Amino acid sequence: EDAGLVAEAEAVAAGWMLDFLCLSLCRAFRDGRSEDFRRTRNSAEAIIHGLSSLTACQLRTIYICQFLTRIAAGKTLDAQFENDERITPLESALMIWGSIEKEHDKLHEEIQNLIKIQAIAVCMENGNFKEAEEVFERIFHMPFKSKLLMIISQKDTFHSFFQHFSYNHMMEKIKSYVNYVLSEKSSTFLMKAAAKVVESKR
Template structure:
């Protein structure tokens, strides 16, 4: 009986044959539904709270975390290195530094050509609205169409044209010119020769150089420069100290040689004391020959000679 009751239990939505569900079962199902909804709401609320906490932590990290600040310095340095490698034509260094920062990403839409993607990125970095930036933007537009036409893809050139000049009020001389060229399929038009790919690259290099001149004093580069200069200073100081030590050693040797008392000087000192008396050092120095001695040196030497019993005079200090 229990098995039959279990097998014939009605679902909350009623039986498959269209019979209504048991009222008691409906009530239980409704409660289970309410409990489930309440549980899901609670989960969503907790999830939002966790996300909010994480966002606050990320904001705090961006504002005050040393790690975030250091990461910003490193990213600035990588961007600076990219610009320099690009301007110097060091392709391998450019690729290596680029891969260190992040992989190049183009649009997920396969119809978007690389130059169109570059045009979108270029438009996003326009802050000063200067003429050089505008010139480069027009050059990218011209080259985006030129590449398609050079490959014989005139239909693609039309599509690229429609995408890059999608604003209805953007009726410019460049737009009219390119539209005419595409309609005539004039692949070798002079505009493509004058505003060539190499011309575009030179303009971009000029722009990047201006950025380098403006941003060349990034903190990480400043800090690295200080470290290098400090090492050079320490090396130079060490070399100077080494040279000074060598000079001092040589000078001390010379001084030692110069101030060593020889037998003739000791004999002259004994004779002087015997003739003029102890204490008359200036008179002794004047009348006897000594090797660059002073009165004080004579006095000190006489004291030493008496201690060593080298003085023949019985005079005292």
């Protein structure tokens, strides 16, 4: 009925806005536009909280946005993303990564491993060796478990190992994944309609 049809239209539009915001968040992440990312993050969060129902596809979209936000805050060790205050931002990203309904291909495994490694490295670069060991215990598996344990034990913050499995390396692999999400939803309604309006003026 009238009110019901309006409510359905609102649900449809909310779904469109979620997709569009995800796309915008991915681009800001890719381009390194930190302030735009923060603002788009707040918008996406508001739209998500306003949803009264979700489809599996939307849940995946939500996870993707949550994942990127945790990654963007990877070095902000004082940021609490989970109810359990002990969980660091990268550990939170790791949990989300392991929940997303996606294929565990090579890129997936590469990202997973790099996040596990950097979750420990960011703590060590802050001189927080006790916290690094605590992160290790919570996370640990991979073939580098023993090496990480040793690196932590010896407080070897700038071990060559980290030079290879660096934060930048982690970021570039995730940006590769973002390019995939980007191409996958660059055709969602809102973005497509807006692009059409922009072109319809040229």
